[PDB]
Amino acid sequence: MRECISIHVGQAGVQIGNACWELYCLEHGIQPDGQMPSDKTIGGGDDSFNTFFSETGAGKHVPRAVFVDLEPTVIDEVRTGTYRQLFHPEQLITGKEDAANNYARGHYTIGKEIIDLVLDRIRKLADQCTGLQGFLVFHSFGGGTGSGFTSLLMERLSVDYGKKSKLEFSIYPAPQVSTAVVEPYNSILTTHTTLEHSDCAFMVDNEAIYDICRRNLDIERPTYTNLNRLISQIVSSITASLRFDGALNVDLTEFQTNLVPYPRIHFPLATYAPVISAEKAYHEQLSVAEITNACFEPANQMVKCDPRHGKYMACCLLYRGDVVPKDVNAAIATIKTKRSIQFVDWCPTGFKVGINYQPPTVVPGGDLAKVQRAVCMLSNTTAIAEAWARLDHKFDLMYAKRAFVHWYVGEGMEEGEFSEAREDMAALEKDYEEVGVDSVE
Amino acid sequence: EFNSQVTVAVRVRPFSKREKTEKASQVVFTNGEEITVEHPDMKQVYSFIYDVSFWSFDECHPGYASQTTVYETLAAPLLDRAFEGYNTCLFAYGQTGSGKSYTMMGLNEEPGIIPRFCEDLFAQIAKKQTSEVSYHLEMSFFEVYNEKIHDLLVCKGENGQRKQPLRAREHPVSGPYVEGLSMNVVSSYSDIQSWLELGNKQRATAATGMNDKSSRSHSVFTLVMTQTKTEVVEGEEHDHRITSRINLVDLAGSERCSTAHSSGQRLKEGVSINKSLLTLGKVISALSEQANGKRVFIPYRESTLTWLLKESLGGNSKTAMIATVSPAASNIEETLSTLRYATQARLIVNIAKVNEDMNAKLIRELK
Amino acid sequence: MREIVHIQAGQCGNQIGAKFWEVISDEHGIDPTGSYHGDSDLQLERINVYYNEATGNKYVPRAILVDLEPGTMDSVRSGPFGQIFRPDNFVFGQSGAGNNWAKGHYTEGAELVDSVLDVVRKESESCDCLQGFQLTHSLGGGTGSGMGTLLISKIREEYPDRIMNTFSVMPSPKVSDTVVEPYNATLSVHQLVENTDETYCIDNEALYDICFRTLKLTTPTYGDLNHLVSATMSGVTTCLRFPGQLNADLRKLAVNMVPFPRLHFFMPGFAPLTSRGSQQYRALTVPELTQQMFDSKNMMAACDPRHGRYLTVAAIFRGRMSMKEVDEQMLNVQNKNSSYFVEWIPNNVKTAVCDIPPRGLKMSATFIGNSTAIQELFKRISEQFTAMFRRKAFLHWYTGEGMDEMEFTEAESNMNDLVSEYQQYQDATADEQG
Ligand SMILES: CC(=O)O[C@H]1C(=O)[C@@]2(C)[C@H]([C@H](OC(=O)c3ccccc3)[C@]3(O)C[C@H](OC(=O)[C@H](O)[C@@H](NC(=O)c4ccccc4)c4ccccc4)C(C)=C1C3(C)C)[C@]1(OC(C)=O)CO[C@@H]1C[C@@H]2O
Ligand SMILES: Nc1nc2c(ncn2[C@@H]2O[C@H](COP(=O)(O)OP(=O)(O)OP(=O)(O)O)[C@@H](O)[C@H]2O)c(=O)[nH]1
Ligand SMILES: Nc1nc2c(ncn2[C@@H]2O[C@H](COP(=O)(O)OP(=O)(O)O)[C@@H](O)[C@H]2O)c(=O)[nH]1
Ligand SMILES: Nc1ncnc2c1ncn2[C@@H]1O[C@H](COP(=O)(O)OP(=O)(O)O)[C@@H](O)[C@H]1O
Ligand SMILES: [Mg+2]
Ligand SMILES: [Mg+2]
């Protein structure tokens, strides 16, 4: 009835999908075989929640998702692992050769002869959907497939489907930590193309979640099976109002509206406050007033950028479980009282609120605890300009000597595409100044 | 610095067929400027002073004011100021069957103010049509009926019901206006006359007990005159323009349901007229108290008429009122309400200005 | 005979109204099947105001449930009183208004509105004589603000001689629940001023104070809040369903509460609300109720009447009250608190008394008040609005759906004129000598 398509691009997106589709099955009562035994006790209804899982007459549940990596390694793990009997075998590998961390390979050259076979599966899924509400794209700046393919895809999806919400969940490069020498380019080339087509780009940064997993969950040697389980929760909160009941339900077009004043600065940040272990689960109250304040604790942000260096233009809080509105209003009133949390002069009503009744589920083998409450924040701040400027300085240090450009030119990229994309990224750094200047009559 | 006062004038009508069948008595006597009402009961006498008085009671008695006289005394100054560069308004007010439509529009062989206005305007234009001054004239003619707006200058299509209503909106500078309104160009008197015929044929009329041709709608005639003139400047000429809006308004009557034997649509439309006059009255009572130091808020949004005429009752226009009264004794209290609202409208003061179309641009700072 | 059509737009109204039928049915003796299991014979005499008889003395309510999301409608069906509504009266779509007034008015609501008129025209024509309408919506979003205001624009054209009552949850002063509350609350007032006769303004921050300060509730859910709004909704329509000594329809209140056609925004109230402990320590009587009704801390409008003047108020009583005890007490208010009333209305109060009280209270009371302190709510939105519209912050989501900046300026000046219409009256007036 209300259905959302997921697109997982690259190693990152797949390794979050696998984290996501391990959680969506548990909440709704599905085994990895696609079957649903607890339908014995209710007799159908909508527990085969059509937002993610379609259903066949044989009792099997197949998810509405499309994977694509241009490398067979990460997806072949799915066809040979626990979830081989859940996914439609059309899991788009064309990985005779990867993108070599090159936005020129992911966009042009190897991006084609596979970009026309990805639209077919989506168009096949949409024609199974009645109330298609939007897309959810999981990718990463820093690669070729998660930087070029997405740009190439989001252009085409802004033509075939037009005015439908396209929300991204992308891994933003960290200021210090990095796994490649070409993250600045591909992160800069992808914004320039994805800016005029997307609607809200949710950013995450692994340097932050590393610190969260150390300080809070007491994990000093984590890996990517832990990070991607937290990201699995953020999406469950965004999509919870489409599956379970609640008091204030939030459709997808509310994030497109309250958090995006102008069509170019739609770059918010995410949080998940009650990231606690089973031991610290005791000794703590875990109330709304406790969980809401943590979401503004800058050490508990999922992107490394201090909001105390900027100002908030909007903020959306997404509650789950045993939450009462009287506890919410008491909490936002405490934040609007504090002076270390500045708001722009043109947004005195700077809080969107949503509440659900279904608490989060606990994956066995996981790091997170069982809780009756859970919160997800989505904030658009002027602090993000600092991160754009950092990527811009790196771009200039390495483009002035024309380093690594012959790998992009060698894949059909013009030299003027680096000067046109770095000059279009120098406009947005000025836009974030105007939105932070207090008006005067 | 300017405070233009509203020009109030009164017109006494002669006896009607009804007021002659019922041999009603004369109570409204004149001496020139002043108008008095001797009640039949002879318990008190009221008297009022006005800028201008007209006595059409007798076609033979001295002091008989004709169509040409009312024109040359009221409208000709407004034409002079409209050529000067002012906005102008002339609006009628009164009861049912009192001579408002006859005064403004007139009949075929007894023209009112509107045709004479347009004719003298075009005459003065043709007599001042130099290469120094060009003239462009647009007209509109519209109708208020049961709080709905309607365009009079269209040839309606055939249907079971063909009256497409329009909407009123508020432009932040120009003020209230009507969206979807035919503004037709005019070059001479003939097109004006044809459009007037079409509009008076499309207007709403009905037969009621106090006038067989009772207008069931308020009628506004708008003329937008743009005169372009030159000044020897650094480059080409034709760099001054003066715009002027002339609003000629014929309103309906209070229409007591008892006398005006009314049931159904007549009651309905009549009730609408009663709600339009109550609002207008309240706006003329608040504008006459806002010109005496006391601060008051004029309610123009409670009626489309007063909403569109925000700029005329107040604001920026040189405006004039024609109160229409009957001399019979069977309508004393309604005549007196008309005369009291007219004596209060006398106290209104507006701020009229020349529409040079240059303020804030360059010559404002020259000045 | 004085029949009413109820319309419920959004996650708020469909959550309020769903309790409104849990409160009326208990008063008329209807079970969740529609079957009658009551005690008195006065219930069935005027049950036709809200209900219709179906087949076997099963009673189906005249409700209309509208929303742009199926999630709210599933709560009604999978609930206590879900099986009584007409399943052909649940109108819904998908892909909701997105907190956008532009969508519920022009783009999405316009696709679903004619379906809503099909229900309204069938329920009204099936009624002998229509007294008016009743809408429960929340302005602050896009469905209730957009798709509700659009219906009123259309029903007022089809039924211009009937009452259109509205129970609207307004934006709150301190804490927001939607980032674009001002744009949607503003444009709704631009339409409600022109197309309504009674608009009861509700604010959740006040109910949070009622539930905490009076009822001594520490965890008040939305069920409890809407258990208060449904009460006033019942008091206003009590003298049509049960008899009394001095009866009052909807029109008699508005004629006695709306002195000018634009000042039809009221501050409701209910009495007697108390905690479960202090009930055994109180004395139920009119001087104890009138003190709660005229208390500024029992309002739902989030506005202090002591910062203004009551132009006109009303009081609906239910029980075996004494009229001397009623008329004596209302006079005590005006003579004591004469500064909070206007001089050019000598008796600023109306009264009404029903003889059949609420299911478990020997006496109840409902209060309706028109004050100039509603200026404070509109004056706030006008500040938030222009602060955002002067920079054009979120405007491109409203223009992209087929709107213009002029429609944002019209609503600003209208709301600002309504402020001045209330502000002239709030300042004390004085004639020359009088
Ligand atoms: C004396 C006793 O045994 O308990 C009382 C009680 O404690 C009080 C406080 C009741 C109680 O009300 C509440 O607890 C409450 C909770 C949240 C929000 C609002 C109220 C009561 O539940 C409410 C109940 O009154 C009613 O049921 C009315 O008929 C009420 N009915 C319903 O609303 C209703 C709701 C769901 C299902 C069935 C009925 C009503 C109110 C207005 C118009 C018509 C009917 C009564 C006497 C009581 C209890 C039971 C504790 C009060 O009820 C009202 C609003 O009239 C709250 O203040 C009154 C005073 C009562 O004494
Ligand atoms: N959070 C998170 N990030 C990941 C994960 N796997 C890879 N990344 C990030 O992905 C970034 C680089 O992109 P790639 O890993 O090469 O993925 P890709 O999009 O397929 O790029 P190509 O292999 O060149 O096609 C690195 O900086 C990693 O931080 C993961 O499992 N979780
Ligand atoms: N009193 C009350 N108000 C509510 C409730 N649910 C939502 N609201 C209000 O309604 C507004 C949300 O608008 P809504 O109609 O739900 O948006 P929509 O889903 O897009 O139509 C918020 O400002 C809330 O204050 C409720 O159960 N009770
Ligand atoms: N000065 C006058 N001389 C001759 N007849 C007049 C005069 N004034 C009014 N009448 C007559 O009285 C009637 C006036 O009706 P009208 O003015 O149209 O009513 P209303 O003013 O209510 O629209 C006309 O039939 C007209 O012939
Ligand atoms: Mg890879
Ligand atoms: Mg006439």
Residue numbers in the entry:
A (entry chain E): 1 to 441
B (entry chain K): -1 to 0, 391 to 755
C (entry chain B): 1 to 434
Question: Which sentences from the paper describe this structure?
Answer:
KIF14 is a microtubule-based motor protein with essential roles during cell division.
The longer K772 construct includes a full neck-linker and the first coiled coil domain CC1. The other four datasets correspond to KIF14 dimers forming a two-heads-bound intermediate with each of the two heads in a distinct conformation (MT-K755-ANP, MT-K755-AAF, MT-K772-ANP, and MT-K772-AAF). Different from the Apo and ADP states in the AMP-PNP and ADP-AlFx states, the MT-K755 and MT-K772 helically averaged cryo-EM maps show a density connecting the motor domains along a protofilament. This density can be well-fitted with the undocked neck-linker of a motor domain positioned further toward the microtubule plus end (leading head) and part of the coiled coil domain connecting with a docked neck-linker of a motor domain positioned more toward the microtubule minus end (trailing head). The neck-linkers connecting density and the combined densities in the motor domain in the helically averaged cryo-EM maps strongly suggests that the KIF14 dimer in the AMP-PNP and ADP-AlFx states binds to the microtubule in a two-heads-bound configuration with leading and trailing heads in distinct conformations. The new maps with separated densities identify the leading head with the undocked backward pointing neck-linker as the one in the open conformation and the trailing head with a docked neck-linker as the one in the closed conformation. In the case of the MT-K755-AAF and MT-K772-AAF maps, there are also ADP-associated densities in both leading and trailing heads but AlFx-associated densities only in the trailing head. On the other hand, in the leading head of the two-head-bound structure, the neck-linker is pulled backwards (toward the microtubule minus end) forming a β-sheet with KL2 and in addition KH6 partially unwinds.
